Design a protein around this nucleic acid. Structure first.
Length: 135
RNA sequence: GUUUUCGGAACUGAGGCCAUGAUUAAGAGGGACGGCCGGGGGCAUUCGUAUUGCGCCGCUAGAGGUGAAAUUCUUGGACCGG
């Protein structure tokens, strides 16, 4: 759990793919290449009920865990790349993604880039649902 | 008997003369011609993420889904990331 860079010299970069659906939120801290992930905590693994898994409360400690999980490695600065469900389905991020990065910015994680990596299509297939829709 | 002037019909030649014979170009149409215009058509071609699937790589206990749940997938490594 040792980083070769000195702490007061600069800040080591990381990246967390904040993915929030409308039933769960994923906080996935990976490396910059994205090929060597560090840890990935969800929103339903911190609440013992399917109700509050997309809730702001289940994601405001899910950053209090994954930041603690990455303080000892030498990492203090991250990128955040928002991504909703996307595809043919909805594109607005889940409600806890607001409270997700607000939790860790107060939990002690420095902030670098903020961007959107939603899977917006050129043109998807026929979206799930009847022609009359979810009536 | 006959041919005629004589009256009719019929054919043809040289003609003469006519004020010698054709309204207009529909704020109707057709066709041309011109520069263009357009998600008109047909054939061919080229692209785009997404979805899904498969292989590898990562790290994992849940993931999906729901007003709420469960059916379902999941240490046989799903989900999530490359």
């Amino acid at each position: 759990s040792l980083g070769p860079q000195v702490a007061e010299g600069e800040n080591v970069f990381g990246v967390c793919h904040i993915f929030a659906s409308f039933n769960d939120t994923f906080v996935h801290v990976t490396d910059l290449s994205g090929k060597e992930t560090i840890c990935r905590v969800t929103g339903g693994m911190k609440v013992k009920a399917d109700r509050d898994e997309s809730s702001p409360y289940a994601a405001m400690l899910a950053a209090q865990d994954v930041a603690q999980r990455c303080k000892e490695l030498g990492i203090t600065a991250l990128h955040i790349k928002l991504r909703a469900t996307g595809g043919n389905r909805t594109k607005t991020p889940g409600p806890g993604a607001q409270s997700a990065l607000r939790a860790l910015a107060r939990s002690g994680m420095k902030i670098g880039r903020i961007e959107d990596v939603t899977p917006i299509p050129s043109d998807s297939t026929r979206r799930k649902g009847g022609r009359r829709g979810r009536r």
